[PDB]
């Protein structure tokens, strides 16, 4: 007998580099962008790129001043995407959508190089392998990754190259709301000061694991069949608001110990494979919003009294919508117990 007609697979149109993204395609096109990020571990030499500078040990809390070369930082990147609404109809808006990331760490078998300048493990032995507090992280979104500044020892003096959270108090060793930032510069935001903000990242998807010990093994899988789905509860992924895909990562992979014992960090690059598609969305900003930004860019800037913020002078705002039967409570108080009064102790 004869075989059957082959299975319909998606038709490849072009493979190449970054200048391939700008093909005028149809509506149901799907693109797969593949990229990487080098870890910015400090890089103390031009000769030793990929490690950190050697670590200080026991300086006091009130006398702690690290240098930039011994601080691992975050990696970040913006991937420019082409505009998609050039040939469609009117009143019809359509953006990108990250559907699936497939990540992987490059270079993980290089830790088997025990014949390097490592520390000798016993009297006639091999080199000490890389082990210590690792940290693996990646984030894929249509917006820059929005950070949160938490750091122990708020009297650490950081150098000029690192943008660490400004004006630290004793509440910066715990959750402090006044340390919001964006991850908007490579090799600037150190990892020991900034965690991704769990309240503000609605358009990114971040994944991070770490095992912090004196001697823990870096356990690293490597597989091309694993797949992370980026969709939310409603079925949409990270929408690229501006035509931009924001990719960020930070991979600390333990402590390399030198021949004299002087420890230093080591990181590895991280692969990204983002599967994009064309999500039809609604235009949020008509020409009423768009005209009103011209009047914004032509009105005189007054510098008056604080009508917004913490020191605001607006005492009360009522908002009315429809009709209602006359309430018997003209100060329409909602909380039956806001302060906690008249509860049992």
């Amino acid at each position: 007998k004869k075989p059957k007609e082959p299975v319909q697979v998606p038709k490849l149109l072009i493979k190449g580099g970054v200048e391939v993204l700008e093909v005028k395609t149809g509506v149901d096109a799907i693109t797969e962008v593949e990229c990487f990020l080098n870890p910015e571990m400090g890089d103390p030499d031009e000769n030793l790129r990929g490690f950190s500078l050697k670590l200080s040990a026991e300086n006091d809390f009130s006398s702690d001043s690290p240098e930039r070369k011994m601080l691992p930082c975050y990696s970040t990147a913006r991937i420019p995407l082409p505009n998609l609404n050039e040939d469609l109809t009117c009143g019809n808006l359509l953006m990108w959508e990250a559907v699936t990331v497939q990540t992987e760490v490059i270079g993980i078998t290089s830790m088997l190089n025990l014949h390097a300048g490592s520390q000798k493990v016993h009297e006639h032995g091999g080199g000490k392998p890389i082990q210590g507090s690792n940290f693996h992280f990646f984030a894929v979104g249509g917006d820059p990754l929005e950070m949160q500044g938490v750091l122990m020892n708020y009297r650490t003096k950081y150098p000029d190259g690192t943008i660490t959270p400004k004006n630290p108090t004793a509440q910066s060793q715990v959750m402090n709301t006044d340390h919001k930032a964006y991850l908007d510069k490579n090799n600037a935001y150190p990892v020991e000061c900034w965690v991704p903000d769990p309240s503000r990242n609605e358009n990114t998807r971040y994944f991070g694991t770490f095992t912090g010990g004196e001697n823990v093994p870096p356990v690293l899988h490597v597989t091309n069949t694993a797949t992370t789905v980026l969709l939310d509860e409603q079925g949409v992924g990270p929408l690229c608001k501006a035509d931009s895909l924001y990719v960020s990562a930070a991979d600390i992979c333990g402590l390399f110990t030198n021949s004299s014992g002087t420890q230093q960090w080591r990181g590895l690059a991280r692969y990204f494979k983002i599967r994009l598609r064309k999500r039809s969305v609604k235009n949020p900003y008509p020409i009423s919003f768009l005209l009103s930004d011209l009047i914004n860019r032509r009105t005189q800037r007054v510098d008056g009294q604080p009508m917004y913020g913490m020191e605001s002078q607006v005492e009360e705002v009522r908002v009315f919508d429809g009709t209602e039967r006359l309430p018997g409570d003209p100060d329409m108080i909602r909380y039956i117990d806001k302060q906690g009064q008249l509860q049992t102790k």
């Binding site: 699936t100 069949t225 694993a226 797949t227 992370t228 969709l231």
Partner: peptide, 14 residues
């Protein structure tokens, strides 16, 4: 994460 062979099944429910 998830295997690649079940990927049209996961996206299909939307």
């Amino acid at each position: 994460t998830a295997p690649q062979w079940m990927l049209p099944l996961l996206l299909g429910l939307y």
